[PDB]
Amino acid sequence: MKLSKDTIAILKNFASINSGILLSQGKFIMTRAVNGTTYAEANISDEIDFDVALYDLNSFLSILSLVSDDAEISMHTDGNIKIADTRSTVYWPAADKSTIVFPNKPIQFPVASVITEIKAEDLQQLLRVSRGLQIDTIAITNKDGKIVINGYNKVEDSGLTRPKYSLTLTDYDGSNNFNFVINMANMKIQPGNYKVMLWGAGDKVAAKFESSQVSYVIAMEADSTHDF
């Protein structure tokens, strides 16, 4: 099989979610955090032609940057990975499945309770400023006919009543009320425009961020509240 730079770039975003991964034959990739808070999946243009688990995905990807962009990769005689370059060969260890955490099946996200969206710059600003104001948690809520994202410092603001940041998304004429809480540490979303689908059913809350390139599913906090 071959890995293009586009695929490689998405795999690099995945490695920040889980340092390891299980690649399965097909044009599809997915991963899930060890703590189960963040899920990611994407359709790729490359065809994976063998199943193999990688313990250190990031270092593997970096190694691909050192060989021909069309380097052919396959499983070697010893069960490990072989990377065939023009005049050289790079062998990389194949991990035993038991040493990495991975999704056994893709996530089928429920029908959304509410849909909104965030633009590339807005997302970029939220991520940029969150780090500078120690925003460790955000809340997506309905306010004044709009869906808004408030950022807080859970540590010194245990009740999330003093926002240090606020971003307006889309208009909301709906009937329901909600305050979905997200741990900023799970927002490993790569830059881009996303359709945001929020879901709540009793004590179960989750969010899905979808772009033309990747889809993420992030679990929401227990202090979340909704009318649905």
Add this chain to the structure above:
Amino acid sequence: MKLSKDTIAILKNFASINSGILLSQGKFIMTRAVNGTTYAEANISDEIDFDVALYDLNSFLSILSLVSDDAEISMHTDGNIKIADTRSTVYWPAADKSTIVFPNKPIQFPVASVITEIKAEDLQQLLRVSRGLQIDTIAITNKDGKIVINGYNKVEDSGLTRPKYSLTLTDYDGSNNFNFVINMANMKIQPGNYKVMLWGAGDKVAAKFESSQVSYVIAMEADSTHDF
């Protein structure tokens, strides 16, 4: 209120002199080191619309680099600060004036003993070489008809007798003799061309560095000597 790139640049310099600052209505800004060693002021093109003290100027400025050109800085209803545009709002704490140190009056330099100048590139060299030569002290003295700056490491050269760096400024057309000492740690001046005025009267010694953008007043060390 809006702060352009240049004003922000100058404020960043001021932030390195004193972590805090008091901003007052007008087109003028000034600050001073907590230990009173370095003073700086400048006239700016941006109009400050309200009085406000910032406890951590540097972090505040870095935050400004993340807002849009449409963002506008203003006093929020809670007495704190707000930086908002059409889509988002960043909140920042307005400090209690008593939690910071600031000049209640600008420092003037009515008279001088000797006047010289240092070009932007020479100031740049002095700053960079001192960093690599562990120079913590400089002396501006007259030698063979010229004004020169000698750099030393007082830590291993108590008498300041072994210069590690020497910079020639201008031809000295005077009859006096001097050796003004400046703690290099107080030379927190931004890059640029500066007119340098040195004043000495008995135990009192001070220097003024003036560029078209800002001007500083620096307290010189007791080690200094002169016959003015």
Add this chain to the structure above:
Amino acid sequence: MKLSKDTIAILKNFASINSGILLSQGKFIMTRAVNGTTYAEANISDEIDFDVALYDLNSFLSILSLVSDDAEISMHTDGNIKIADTRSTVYWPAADKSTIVFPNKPIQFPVASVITEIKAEDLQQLLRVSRGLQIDTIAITNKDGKIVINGYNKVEDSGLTRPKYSLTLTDYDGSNNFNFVINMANMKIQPGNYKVMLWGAGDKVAAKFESSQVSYVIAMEADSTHDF
């Protein structure tokens, strides 16, 4: 003296092998690691007009990037070094020869047992990959009519049996068999194209990497075997 960007570039590589160095009059420079593993020499275009030992070559070189490219370097009246710039002077200490380690005479490499070569692009990959794969040892051997380099991690593969990398160098039709082991830590070779001269006689084994810019002599490990 005057040191061109080219000579400085070479000296920097030399500083990675031994922090100090001894400059002798002429247009030749050399150095050797304190542990004796690697030696390096070069003929430069700049004429060294006085002898001086440098305790910290790397810091010296960085200081030179702060002055004009044509600054004059010489022996000061105090026995130390003087670097004369257009409008300034930087002083640098001349080390006592007994505080640094240096070759007393250049290395006369024996006539080679086998000769091969490595392209700049291939050396670059070798060096880069080694870091990403934790390769601490390489072996240059004859395999299927060619000379190849295999990279290993000796900590987990002491018998050097499980190659993590392999690079094909040149065709080989000799009768001799050899497995020359080199410690990757000693491969502090600057980029370029090199003629590789391998030598073995009984338990003495050594390699020489030669380019038109620099020459390196590296001692090879005891694990090495050959039938020369």
